Design a protein around this ligand. Structure first.
Ligand code: K
Ligand code: K
Ligand code: K
Ligand code: K
Ligand code: K
Ligand code: K
Ligand code: K
Ligand code: MG
Ligand code: MG
Ligand code: MG
Ligand code: MG
Ligand code: MG
Ligand code: MG
Ligand code: MG
Ligand code: MG
Ligand code: MG
Ligand code: MG
Ligand code: MG
Ligand code: MG
Ligand code: MG
Ligand code: MG
Ligand code: MG
Ligand code: MG
Ligand code: MG
Ligand code: MG
Ligand code: MG
Ligand code: MG
Lengths: 147, 261, 184, 200
RNA sequence: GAAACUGCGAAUGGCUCAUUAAAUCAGUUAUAGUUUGUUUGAUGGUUACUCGGAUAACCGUAGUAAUUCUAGAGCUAAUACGUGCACCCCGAAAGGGAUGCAUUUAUUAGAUAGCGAUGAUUCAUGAUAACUCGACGGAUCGCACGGCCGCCGGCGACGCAUCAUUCAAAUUUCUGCCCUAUCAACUUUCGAUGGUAGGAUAGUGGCCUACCAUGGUGGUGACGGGUGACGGAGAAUUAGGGUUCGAUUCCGGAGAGGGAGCCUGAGAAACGGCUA
């Protein structure tokens, strides 16, 4: 199961030992798995509404809100645990020569288990509160490379 | 800094105060109050620079310490009290009463009022939410809190506030077709009819306003202030009536004035 | 003193950060409470930013614990720390921290259970007690530990912050998870 | 070594200078707040008991209670505590100052003594005349306690007892009495009624 | 009305440019990630005709070469200090428990398309079970005197608590900086990158600890070195493009001989504050 840490992982506020049943109640009530919509026109993946993973940094089932800048880029590194490096490619204008030069920036981003990603896939990231020393973004959508 | 700044350098003061740059090193630092320091007119500016009743900083203190000036019906003795948009300033000895409104060039104008019209003001609703004990309340953009508001009132609406009963007399819902004034930005002081509302999820909402002469300008929702339902404002406007003239048109009037005057 | 600034850290690239200012008071830390289980209760009052107050518990012996399924909360004595997911050294030192698994006295909950269900683990009174006994269900794992007089509980408060050690009684799959960690 | 002898019951005080080491052996090794018999201090002090309150060393540094040494140490003191007056200094400001220990030793330059029990012959200028208190009670409850007044008995009629009369160099007559504090008057009851009225 | 206690302020201003090269800083964001004396608005339950003990000024014994260095004794105040009137459960439906506000935890409601808001929150807020050894819920002051037959009552001042507001800070998103490769690899045992659980913090965060994973950056120049490098608004010269400068009065940052540490406080790692 998802219980792989030393502590028991669960969603905060979802009581799992209630005598009554959760049939007919909203998410997060009656022991039902909690999930939410982040707004801005983004859809909640089926893997997050019907999954069993526990991720307090997940934008759909965790305790983090999306607000600020929405960016897009390509998955550059997917070797960390639930974190990827997103490469953003842009052109910098060199004024004196009236021409452009290619630049890039690597943006660390948290990716919830509901998303599948590989190097080269296109990802959309939304800003959230600091999740670690460098992570300030959460993956909101993944488009497989060549699609 | 290790805390709060108590001084305002004269060149850093808001431009709409129209302070001369060589008048001194400092400008009046607006006190905390209902309006923001960048969107207000301290009483010292009003009494000395606009009305000329006081000739110096010292004389403004004498006037206020005699309890001769009232803002929104209450006596104020703070020289840097931040009087702002729609505030009613009353001076019983001179029998005068003004409303702070923007002229079409974006500067505060002391619009003389009649004794009857000086008994109320307009306020923009900031938000409506439940307070302690589940009691609903609304707060405005002039720092006021009203409990038990009408359930129909929502954010960005305008309420007519009676300065005697201190109660909501009537309100205007924020909707397309009403007459509004711009209270911030490039178009500050312009009056028109709200024609459209463009919402952008997560971003600022833009509102397209059309002047009475067909001139259309946009601005942010935060800079709009509904003045009346339909096309007639609930308050008296200055002579320009929020009509912004081009520099060419303004020069045309000035030329004609010299010929006649 | 203890500081929470990032100036002493390496950059994400790995390069060093040359110091450009001294430590600020608004980024300070403080010594940990290291709350222990002891009958000599001691909570010291700490003045924090804004003139507000924090309560730092050095020693505690009782806590306010809630039986979630029964929706009953009682003050009870803390008996022992049995498991800690962060550091096993906090178990043998009997340190009270949030999310630590502890054993609490079962006596206060037994009294409520007898007063509520009329069971050990006045005409109108017996009318309702039997009525409540129809929908009475007690987990076998939860009942087995009432005989010993101790209930496994999880601390949900932060004793070093609020000065208290409150929690809830373990039950369901959470109880199964931790009792398997203690089965050695 | 000098001695500052004070008589709390009488309000009088006097300085005594003694140079006989054999007579000072009674005080040496004593600590603050400990009592010393005046028999060996002299003949006129027979039957007198003195309490050691403190003193200053030959460099003027004061003795501090609790410093269980005969020498000088440096302590970080708070304002207003003994050995650190801290006048004109910031609130919360601490200072490191030199303080002599609490154990009496020949290194002291003066000792402050309090007569806790008088002997046979009354000392001249210490137990002969009683100096009156400069000021009488000012709080209402203390005036009633002083004169054993009751709840119904008026208190403002007794402050005239210790009213101070005198003549000014430029005038002829002048009397002064204290203002009674915590005195229940019609105005105080009016304030209480108004405060309750506001709540309703 | 001196003095003195109490209160507040002294964290602004002024000065300077040493350190500092994605850092400061600029435009642009975010706080649903926090604190905020004051101002302004609103809001605070159904011995008491008023408690207690101290202390200053003052008074008078002083010490030391000496300092807003200092000891002892006698007095007396408070808006100082310490106190204190001030629906649910059990149940022989009597009686009892809890019953303000705040604090801490848990259960529960917060719909639908009686029932509020958002682009978005188990959010605002409600109810319930308990919890805390809670600087909270006025032992204060001025002026004016009136109306009822002792009762009632006016206009102010100051103060406590909560929310909103204002004044702000802290942290923070995106993009942007001079020369140097005779600097090509750098980071990671002792945090480097990320994960889980805690601790600490006003609060987010390897900020710190335990455990786990092996990541993170780099010819689109990392890392290192140089700067007689604070950044910007701007300044000089300019057909156009450009070159050079920007210590200095506006804004931001930083420092107070060098480091470090800290008290007081709403606010300082303060220096015309303290400790080394
Ligand atoms: K600052
Ligand atoms: K201060
Ligand atoms: K910026
Ligand atoms: K820059
Ligand atoms: K934190
Ligand atoms: K972590
Ligand atoms: K203060
Ligand atoms: Mg300054
Ligand atoms: Mg927003
Ligand atoms: Mg009094
Ligand atoms: Mg003073
Ligand atoms: Mg360098
Ligand atoms: Mg950057
Ligand atoms: Mg809630
Ligand atoms: Mg954490
Ligand atoms: Mg570690
Ligand atoms: Mg430069
Ligand atoms: Mg330099
Ligand atoms: Mg410069
Ligand atoms: Mg220089
Ligand atoms: Mg200069
Ligand atoms: Mg400057
Ligand atoms: Mg500094
Ligand atoms: Mg120097
Ligand atoms: Mg310093
Ligand atoms: Mg100096
Ligand atoms: Mg200074």
């Amino acid at each position: 199961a998802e219980q792989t840490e030393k502590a028991f992982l669960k969603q905060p506020g979802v009581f799992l030992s209630s005598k009554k049943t959760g049939k007919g109640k909203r998410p997060g009530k009656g022991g039902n798995r909690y999930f939410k919509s982040i707004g801005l026109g983004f859809k909640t993946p089926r893997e997050a509404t019907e999954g069993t993973y526990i991720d307090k940094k997940c934008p759909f089932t965790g305790n983090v809100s999306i607000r600020g800048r929405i960016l897009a880029g390509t998955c550059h590194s997917a070797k960390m645990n639930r974190t990827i490096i997103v490469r953003r490619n842009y052109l910098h204008y060199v004024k004196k020569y009236q021409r452009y030069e290619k630049r890039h920036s690597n943006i660390p981003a948290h990716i919830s288990p509901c998303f599948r990603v590989k190097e080269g896939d296109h990802v959309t990231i939304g800003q959230c509160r600091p999740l670690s020393k460098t992570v300030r973004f959460n993956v909101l959508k993944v488009i497989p490379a060549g699609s | 800094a290790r805390g709060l700044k108590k001084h305002l350098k004269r060149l850093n003061a808001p431009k709409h105060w129209m302070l001369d740059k060589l008048g001194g090193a400092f400008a009046p630092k607006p006190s905390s109050g209902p309006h923001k320091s960048r969107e207000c007119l301290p009483l010292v500016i009003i009494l000395r620079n606009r009305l000329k009743y006081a000739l110096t900083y010292r004389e403004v203190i004498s006037i206020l310490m005699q309890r001769q000036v009232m803002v929104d019906g209450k006596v104020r003795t703070d020289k840097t009290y931040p009087a702002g948009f729609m505030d009613v300033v009353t001076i019983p000895k001179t029998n005068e009463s003004f409303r702070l409104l923007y002229d079409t060039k974006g500067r505060f104008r002391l619009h003389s009022l009649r004794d009857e019209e000086a008994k109320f003001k307009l306020c923009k609703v900031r938000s409506v939410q439940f307070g302690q004990k589940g009691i609903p309340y609304l707060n405005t953009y002039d720092g006021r809190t009203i409990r038990y508001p009408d359930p129909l009132i929502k954010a960005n609406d305008t309420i007519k506030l009676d300065l005697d009963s201190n109660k909501i007399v009537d309100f205007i819902k924020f909707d397309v077709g009403n007459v509004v004034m711009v209270t911030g930005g490039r178009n500050r002081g312009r009056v028109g009819i709200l024609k459209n509302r463009e919402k952008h999820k997560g971003s600022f909402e833009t509102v397209h306003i059309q002047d009475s002469q067909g001139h259309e300008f946009a601005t942010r929702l935060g800079n709009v202030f509904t003045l009346g339902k339909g096309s007639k404002p609930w308050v008296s406007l200055p002579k320009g009536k929020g009509i912004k003239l081009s520099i060419i048109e303004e020069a045309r009037k000035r030329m004609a004035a010299q010929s006649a005057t | 003193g203890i500081s929470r600034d990032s100036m002493h850290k390496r950059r994400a690239t790995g390069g060093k950060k040359k110091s450009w200012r001294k430590k600020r008071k608004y980024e300070l830390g403080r010594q940990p409470a290291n709350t222990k289980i002891s009958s000599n209760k001691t909570v010291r009052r700490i003045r924090v930013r804004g003139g507000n107050v924090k309560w730092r518990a050095l020693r505690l012996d009782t806590g306010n614990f809630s039986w979630g399924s029964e929706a009953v909360t009682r003050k009870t004595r803390i008996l022992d720390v049995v498991y800690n997911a962060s550091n096993n050294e906090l178990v043998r030192t009997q340190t009270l921290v949030k999310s630590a698994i502890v054993q609490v006295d079962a006596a206060p909950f037994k009294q409520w259970y007898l007063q509520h269900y009329g069971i050990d683990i006045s005409n109108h009174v017996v009318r309702k007690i039997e009525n409540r006994q129809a929908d009475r269900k007690l987990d076998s794992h939860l009942e087995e530990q009432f005989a010993s007089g101790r209930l496994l509980a999880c601390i949900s408060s932060r004793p070093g912050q609020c000065g208290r050690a409150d929690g809830y009684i373990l039950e369901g799959k959470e109880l199964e998870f931790y009792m398997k960690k203690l089965q050695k | 070594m000098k001695f500052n002898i004070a008589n709390p019951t009488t309000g009088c005080q006097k300085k005594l200078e003694i140079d006989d080491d054999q007579k000072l052996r009674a005080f040496f090794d004593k600590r603050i707040s400990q009592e010393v018999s005046g028999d060996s201090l002299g003949e006129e002090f027979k039957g007198y008991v003195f309490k050691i309150m403190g003193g200053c060393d030959k460099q003027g540094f004061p003795m501090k209670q609790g410093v269980l040494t005969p020498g000088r140490v440096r302590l970080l003191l708070y304002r207003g505590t003994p050995c650190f007056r801290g006048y004109g200094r910031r609130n919360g400001e601490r200072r490191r100052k030199s303080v002599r220990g609490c154990i009496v030793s020949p290194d002291l330059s003066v000792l402050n003594l309090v007569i806790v029990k008088k002997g046979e012959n009354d000392l001249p200028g210490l137990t002969d005349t009683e100096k009156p208190r400069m000021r009488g009670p000012k709080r209402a409850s203390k005036i009633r306690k002083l004169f054993n007044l009751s709840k119904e008995d008026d208190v403002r009629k007794y402050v005239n007892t210790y009213r101070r009369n005198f003549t000014t160099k430029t005038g002829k007559n002048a009397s002064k009495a204290p203002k009674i504090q915590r005195l229940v008057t019609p105005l105080t009851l009016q304030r209480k009624r108004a405060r309750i009225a506001d709540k309703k």
